[model samples]
Target chain A: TDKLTSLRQYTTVVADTGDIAAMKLYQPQDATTAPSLILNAAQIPEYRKLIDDAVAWAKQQSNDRAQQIVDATDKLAVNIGLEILKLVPGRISTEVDARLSYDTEASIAKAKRLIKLYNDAGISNDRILIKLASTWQGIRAAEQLEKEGINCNLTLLFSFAQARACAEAGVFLISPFVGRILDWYKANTDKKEYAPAEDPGVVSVSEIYQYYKEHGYETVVMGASFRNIGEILELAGCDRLTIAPALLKELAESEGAIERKLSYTGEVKARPARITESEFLWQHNQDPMAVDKLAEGIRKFAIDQEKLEKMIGDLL
Target chain B: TDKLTSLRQYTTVVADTGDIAAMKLYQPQDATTAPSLILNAAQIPEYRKLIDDAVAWAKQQSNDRAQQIVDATDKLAVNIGLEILKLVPGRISTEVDARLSYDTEASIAKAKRLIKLYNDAGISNDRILIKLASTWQGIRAAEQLEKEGINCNLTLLFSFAQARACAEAGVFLISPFVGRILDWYKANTDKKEYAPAEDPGVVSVSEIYQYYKEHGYETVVMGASFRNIGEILELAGCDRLTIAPALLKELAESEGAIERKLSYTGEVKARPARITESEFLWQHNQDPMAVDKLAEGIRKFAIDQEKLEKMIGDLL
Candidate 1:
């Protein structure tokens, strides 16, 4: 059997990019976006209407009687969300501004604003899970939103604290770093070679999956940001796999039975302890690998957000 | 060395009410408001403008002009927040809708909307600390906001889990609670009388403070929702004490030098263990007191909010 067929049997396929043709080709169940991808999508000449409509609307509301680039971002994001919604059969993970990653309330505000924009357009919140960084605050916010019937996808997760908090908060899902985790280990160590079993990223997400399954949490673990097909296959039995278009095609072309490496067989010790602020910080601090990758991920996300803001300004 | 003067020597005194005169009489460093307090204040004949102005703005903004009640609640909350802003030197802890206590993104949106209203009216976000319930999500949300330079005050905190999460999130401040803790113990047990040192509420806040200070965490610990002057005095040297006017009056009336009962000194153990979702839920499940009190607190806030929403319905 093709790996794609076997993987899809065990996992929901999610397209992890802004490209529409790729989404159509793969026929993904869900879709996810980041600021960089959105900024790129908005720049395409064909999608100028998305930018223009948002600018037109913002001009009517701002005190300066001009386009509010910030406000337009919400409109722009929800519009993008709506477009993606039309392509996918399941939920879409539309991220709040990455700059609000540390600001729990601000993150929540932008998401609700996005949710409302979707709602006003006849999209119920069930089709959307607001994406936020897995900062202590982000997890807390996701927990709150989950309780309020707004599901969330906790992204940029680098540590157990991040995953644990997301799960504890009753998040709909968590995207634990896969390739990035492997990248960190690769960068730091002079490993000549390593098997999938030793892949740090796979190990991290595997631990998260086992922990969640054993503890009875409904939070889905989606191993994200993979660098290669091997990383994707390593977490093949994850509840979901958000893959890049190239990777999806590669998996579709390959003919092999995808192995299930993770499951809920081993009993996790009585539920993991809730991380105190001190513990969360201290644990995160202890993991230099986690610290570096998380910071880099956020830095890149924020940088992309700034670019989007500048683009919004120019479009107006 | 009156008690109020002695208390003021080390800790900031915050007036925890919307009564402007009470704030002026006490000359507090800051002020706080909730739906219930805002509703009570709006009832005064002179504050009709507060209600009318909010209703007018909501009428202009709402697509469903008929359901102005919901939108007006958002406007009215900020109006009250702004009014309290005028009366205090430091900041105001304006609340989002309690119905959003569980919805992280919704609360964030409401808060940002409030912040924007304040900003448009020439108030800076620095002068306001958004108040959120101390649910796991609330703490996480506060963590996000704290990083974005939007300080937060985590309220309705009655558990170490809540307090620990807030501190981990680097929240600007937390209201660990005193009277509510006492109420929980009193209601659950047969304790008829107890000294301040033995007060469950006092003990809880003290431990929270000691933990933060000892660990060098910057999050301020404010003892809030006091049942008596003794509870207030018990946590005198806390980072802050948000006192109701009645308690402020009692403190102002007392005429004895008060010594500090608690301060950060002893070294705390290494940061507490990070809590996973299964862990957090299971641990909370084990703590019957935390579950009941947290539920009770959110229920009260939510009920008051509905009444306020109904009041706005009447106004429209």
Candidate 2:
């Protein structure tokens, strides 16, 4: 009973939405902010002051209209993350600009800017995890950020190639998108529904988690983008699980025994072989599901980021 | 929403136990009998006449006491199977003596005898699948029998090695033990329970099923020895599922949408590489759970067969 309470014993629950009310209601250990989440929250009247403050600060810092709006969007993201950080005990994941996902230097610069904004707000890099798309460039960006003592959370990861590359890069954490992987599989295949354990999304994350533990990789596995409570329950014992409010409520309301599905110890199925950049690209390309999902994810996020900028421009 | 009816659309439901009453109650498409089931059913007063008929036939055929009892046990198994065949329209899986599981010639001889008994009773080998332990010898026995047009069902299967060997041998079907695999993992590890989809047994069977389908192998995967309805439901679209009476009733009573979890099409994860006899043995030896469980399964079945023999000897 109370699967949420039972799940908390094995996994650190992280809220996937930016709504502070939702985070407060479920009391997650950590929180992650996406542009889609912040965009919807930004449109709410109660959050008007947050938007006004960011725009006011951006105008003072930049003379160009377009740059001011872009700067204000970043400020708004940090503002939302800071509010969420106050509610969750653990770190808040703030994503880098999706447009810079293919540029190692640009991604690194955007991540630093987000980290500095948090640092200026009296929050250390310890309280912030810079989220980046799991492109070769983004993983390299994360590699550089880790050396700078800023933890990185590799997001939009879908394949073994992405997971292996992230571990080799020694990123602080990786969020392998679960529901999106399932979505791609369901659409492309004849079978529509999967039992939680056999869900392509759940299987992919578990494989990555098992591989990481077997090789003693320090990179944390934070399973993200679950479609149902079954998928979340199937991954109960993962390092961290980022769940949306609807599914979290379902878990909190339902009563059942939560079995631990993963652990730090697993069968050593492979040796610790590092992948070169070329190998990583080739492997990722070979996986049709992963290739399509990764590209689609970047496009989706970029669209949301653009929508958020337009919202900020309208305010100015 | 009887899950059983919904499941039948995708998978052929086979009753796993020897109880004719259960076979009638659940109306399974097929049935499988173990020595343990026949042993327990033999003691029932209602089924005593079946045993008596077998004993009478064995006494007339053999003068030696030890050989007579062994013949009676095999006769008793066939008698039970004939009664079951009357209820199911598809097939009945009748097992060879587990003690002969490792002896290639003995297993082959025994399988032929079982088929001959069914043939004498006006039942075709088309309606009978000779069940054998999934050992190297058993696989070889099945291979020889398949060439003779007698179908075989490879049972006590617990690993990919056994499955691959069975597929290579082109056995008629495979009953991969699901609950037994889960039992070993639970006892060996700290984890006491598993969500249905992630259960070790479920995973093993799914892998074998996928492998068979991808390679265009005609060997049907019949998931066997389920611990609960959840395990059965997770494999709803498997080729066939041999469920115990309790789980069959649960599925019959429960209402839910049974999503097809498997199909004939899947991504070809491996090439059609055949394993040599030595490769099969070494590969099987490498999987600790499969090694222990296969040995343990044979031991358990052998013990039950001995008990059945004692029951027949007491009757004489």
Candidate 3:
């Protein structure tokens, strides 16, 4: 109980896993959804009803998963997103298929299709962010989607270059992974201990937040992928943070004081800043750590995706 | 204790705040560093001593703070970054001044300066990411810097166009702010609750991860700016996530099992997705949100730079 109380004092409670019942129990300020979560839920008999209903609806539109139909994967993602929206009362983020990550056209088409589906279902575009990869193509897709009054959430960001590009493109939001960076740093350095204020992840996100807030960029900064309460407390005043149900439970049970550490209006406004075009290229070319990490991250993800597909195939 | 244990199971422990003392107490796997953290640390009596020592060692070159004889703020940032690198044994992200967000040449120049400083300090470029704001200018700068073997981390990204441009430029990495997007969604929406699997921020990061993994881009994806553990859990397999120390501590104390939810090689494969120049431009034009935000980000950063200059002036 004391530990839970401490956890709440430092972190904003968020429901991480995709179990809606758990979310309701935790009552997190926000929730996050993913395909894997959806897939996992689909396997659960309790949540299977939603999947069956959607599938039945999909069958009415078209029976083939590979077939181009109004209710294809993208459509299903939007449908799921919308369904989840009903539960959270917050904005729903529907993702473009990974297969379309590099195809700007395809991604755009899928995003547009998703928006249309949402709109057709009486969901407003403002309440949705079409999620796209932080790749060049994905960014371009989000750029187009944003222009159409459909907000976009740029994901898979590991570098400043990605954040710069997303901000420049004027996407609705961006999610910077925090825990993954820590893992890379630890594995690379062969170290296990870290000081709270000296956290590499905390430092990364703080710079981003300062830059965004200082620049008056409407683009919100949401820190994603955390490993501990220290990370959350360090980012207490961040724009928004999504937490897991378990963490939420900890926060709910805890009675510790939570303070706002970041003040965008005061401290952020006091900082003088500028956005240099050359900075992106120069930084990318200069930082070997960023370069190596970027490459390694992609390679690792690509490998994992392949494995996931195989697993999915076997299961399907 | 059980909730704390479960919390660890779902999220990677990360230090969320910029308190090095806190980080040391938490003993997280990795750490993150930011400008604010560095700046804040620099103000502390101990940290100031470190900066003073570094400055004392520098050959006096000028009398002005901008052209100081000792260390300039820019140099100060690099020095701090290097110091942080020593503590974390992970990659340290040193941000470019927001003032340079729109100046391609200035951004590049600053980046080069930062790299040389790091190299001079015996900190390998491989351990640092020259952070820059996400702007067309910033992306272009990153492109050129990459050609010169300078690595970069693009920051302030809120749109996909920015990401596309960076990837097209062959930059090393990108940081997309997740909580910021959730902020926008919250401000725009009246809903207060959301499903764990459907948080806008979560969806955004996951989509970007999928896109990058599926597109075969060499660029790494790191999610930054988090609001809760839910956001972190949603992006379990991201390349890297820079978190604060507070959250990291929370994660460490918890005893839940941790699992990798997303992997590149396991679930998906890269596709031959393409985008034309015309399409890119058209997409940018279409996304009002992207365009407005880009301009807004630039303006805001420019303003912040002015404010920072004033702060410096006052210090002088």
Candidate 4:
């Protein structure tokens, strides 16, 4: 369908599912691998073979369930990421443990370990974006990692404070969650009315887009977690939007006008403003909204990660 | 209604519109100032009176169009921000010119100038966040500005790369657009079939939230540009969530369960990783999604700024 063509026209199409088979079908420029997706893929007979291979390879090296096996599983994720990279010829984002949403040192160590695994497996360091939580500590870890030549993707961002910190650190990229915001609005708002142009999610990303352009920050913004075709079309010109196979199919089937909604380097010449660490801390402290939201986000993700980890353990 | 109260229970309520009357009514913790909101306020007789007063004050200093008048308008924006800040004992985010989204040097210069204006008027730098675009140049400028002791809020973040960059640069805060992400999903997805929880916008923000928390970055996250009460609730425990009076009212009226959803300390811990400048550039170069979006975001904002400037000029 022209949906793929239309979808590809605006955003660099990304496969969201972990199924390497699907990655081949969609032929996306990049692919995102989530824990859930990876777990799901591992259950499938075809995909299970890869996991089995990874496990067997681990056994060949060592037989310890707690240490060697854990290392092997971590390596498995990187192996999958590296394999996916071969398909897209682009960077692959491998998420650190979701449970590490607060511990900066742990998150950093895990990310380095993952990259090291990838590097050990013959994957180039340039093709990996160690995904981390968007907490204060997470930003700090990413900052350190970036200083050491490790690229990271700050994920699960729900607030502006996180974005500011990430940009200040000069990290590689930031993935702003689009669909999650819509979900929050729907559950909380009494009114069901949503204007396409003035939709909260659209406006949020648009503001970010404008701010980035005007200020000339190099950190790329990839709009992630879309729910509908409308959201996709509105953000037609975003850097990269990871899409599901269903939506990809829909885009392939639809026939409509595709417009470029975002651009860079026009009349705006965003000048740099100065900020201090103390000032940043104070501002963060003063903005109860930012502080509270960040804490809440960490809690939720930690819970989810626990659930996911339990599921993984059960499977094993 | 309980909507406002409920919203407050989870998120730090914020006045999104430029209407001083609304800010007075809701008494939000903070007030976000945008060019459009400022322009809209300037058109009203009451706000016009305020603008005129500022302009007269500027005329006393100089009569230069580009230098004096423009600076006067900038001061006028800060004046409005200050007025809003006075209503709440919280920080006010003052936006730099969207027209300068790409020129880091210009953005930095203007941001410094804005800070000077605020300082000249006896405003503490801690009470202000010099809002800049989430562009590469913007982040670099912010880094320099932060070193010089100017606090900044990186606005318009739509991607992970943007957040990472900000954090690495050690900026004060980041404002991730929540509503805008939803808008894109709605526009791109099936209207009749979309669900709020599964909304792309919500998911996008959620992922970012997790990443931030897991990594333990000090950068704060403030969820901005909400579409409905649902989006706000779903992101209830974010660092900070800026809400419009309408949404605030909805939140105040609601009596639903308000619970903390995210936290930083009780999460998982892993080893720390570091990032380097070369790695940052390489990662940016590799992620086409981020590269394309960064460019597109800048162009779009620049266009909007032009339009906004034109609108202001016509009014004058």
List model 3 lDDT by residue over A1-316, tens digit each.
Answer: 4443444444444455556687566555555655555555555666555554555665667656544333544444555666567677667666665545656888888788778878888998877777676766677778788888988877667777777777877888887777777876786576776775677877887888777878777886777777877777678878777665655555566555666666566444443333343455345434334544443444444344444344333422
* Over 4 Å off, model 2: A264-271, B1-316
lDDT of 4 by residue, A1-27 (tens): 365686577678777876777677878
Q: Scored by CA lDDT, what does every candidate get?
A: 0.79, 0.86, 0.63, 0.71
- When only the first chain is scored, the TM-scores of the models are 0.94, 0.97, 0.81, 0.88
**How would you order the candidates by DockQ, starting with the best?**
3, 4, 1, 2
Superposed model 3: Cα runs more than 4 Å off: A1-14, A63-65, A68-72, A265-282, A285-316, B1-316
lDDT of 3 by residue, B1-316 (tens): 5322444444433443445675456544344555555556666665665555455544365555655432455566666665556566556677776756757887898888878878888877768777787766778789888888888888766666566766667788887777766766675468756664677766766776666777677887777777776676667767766665545545556565556665666555655444454445445434333443444444554554455345344444
* Chain B TM-scores of the candidates: 0.94, 0.96, 0.82, 0.87
Model 2: lDDT equals 0.86
Please give, for residues B1-316, the per-residue lDDT of candidate 2 as tens digits: 7899999999988898888999879889899989899888887788988989999999999899998998899899999998998898989989998878767888888989888888888998899999999988789889999999999999999879899999999999999999989988887688998999799998888888888888788899999888888888888889999888888888889987779987665565555677876456546645767766776777788889988888888988
Native A-B interface contacts kept, per candidate: 0.00, 0.00, 0.06, 0.00
CA RMSD per model (angstroms): 20.9, 18.4, 19.5, 14.2
TM-score-sorted candidate list, best first? 1, 2, 4, 3
Tens-digit lDDT track of model 2 for A1-316: 6999999999998999988998879899889988788888887787888899999999999899988988899999999888888898899999887877777887888888888888888999888899999988899999999999999999999889999999999999999999999898887689998988799998899889888888878899999998888889889889999999999889889987788988765455555668876457546655767766776677678789999988788888
| Candidate 1 Cα deviation (angstroms), residue B9 | 38
What interface root-mean-square deviation (Å) does model 3 yield?
A: 12.8
How does each model score on TM-score? 0.51, 0.50, 0.47, 0.49
